[PDB]
Amino acid sequence: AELTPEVLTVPLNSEGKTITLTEKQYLEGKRLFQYACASCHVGGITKTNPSLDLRTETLALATPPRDNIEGLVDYMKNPTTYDGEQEIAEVHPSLRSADIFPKMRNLTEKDLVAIAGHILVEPKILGDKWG
Template identity: 65%
Template sequence: MFKRFPWFSCILSLLLSTALYQPVNAIELDEATLTVPLNTSGKTTILTPEQVKRGKRLFNNTCSQCHNGGITKTNPNVGLDPEGLSLATPPRDNIEGLIDYMKNPTSYDGAESIAELHPSIKSAEIFPKMRNLTDDDLFTIAGHILIQPKVVLEKWGGGKIYY
């Protein structure tokens, strides 16, 4: 059959190779996955696929040295998982809360500024990677952080068990 229809083997090879190289944890980025909390009042926003892609790139370039996989290397008790973000003061489990944190970070209980210890817009002179980030950049980074639990599930912020 392959000798009679040589194009058939090419198509079959293409279909098999495409199926074999799909990421195991890949899920379709549907509207539910792309919908994230905007603020503490319950308002949500839907990220575009472009924002997701850009947020991942910016997160990897700016944040992943200390937060690879949603963990916090300097303090394993505080991660970027939904529970950890929601229990912070103020809550950081929404876009506005994360942007506020990236501009002016505070301790987990919100009592004191940690801008000299944690990269932020406020401390961009100490942390050069923060210098050129715009509000749109911070929005997409926050979006990336918030959709990861939907994409990689319990691995996000799972610590040494997964990373």
Template identity: 65%
Template sequence: MKKQISFMHFVLGLCAIISCSNTSLAIDLDETTRTIPLDSSGSTVILTPEQVKRGKRLFNASCGQCHVGGVTKTNPNLGLEPDALSLATPPRDNINALIDYLKNPTSYDGSESIAELHPSTKSADIFPKMRSLSDEDLFAISGHILLQPKLGGEKWGGGKIYY
């Protein structure tokens, strides 16, 4: 019994350390790192530490099942890395474009709606996790997607190469 308690304390302590380090990570990121493309005209926005934390939490809860590490499980050749996002039609490499996608997803070439296949607010009746997401939540999720390449480098979205 004593070993189990010690092990549990170790695990709880480790969880506390990880939790604290994740919380401080968002606060420790400088403004340059938190600066993300806002729209296709080149405008940028600086994510707040709260948006960084919220985006990570919401992404993991709503998107992480299919996009762990920025990979797309249904198509590992197409991830959420900047190059793939910029080559989509229309380009999805900024906050506003990703929000639009999360509301009305289209195929990579932009030719058809995939709202019945990909979670979106448009298809919230099919994908319940999307029902409660506000525009602020979609903004935070989009910010998380665009911030990750700055933090994880080419591993984010690297697909089958890394995972």
């Protein structure tokens, strides 16, 4: 609904720690996600591979868990297959493949956190519309 505490608060790691994103992080997240991710994940979907969307439940069942800030930031640095067995930076934009995916060259740690925050917050605002 509105940017209330539960909407802005998401898991920071898989151990249970949480983080309450700021309104500024919320706005930065929308800007950055549109810039570097929307081309393939607009609205939470995943073009070319619909089943591996950005819905929170889908991320929670990924390996390692991607339903928390650290897990998503880690994915943006070193993306892996859903079972976490193989790294896929050559196909998936990441800091490790920033040479062939230029838009990733300009992302700071703070930017990565904001983008991760966007992914975890949106479904709480859009419900099923996300994904």
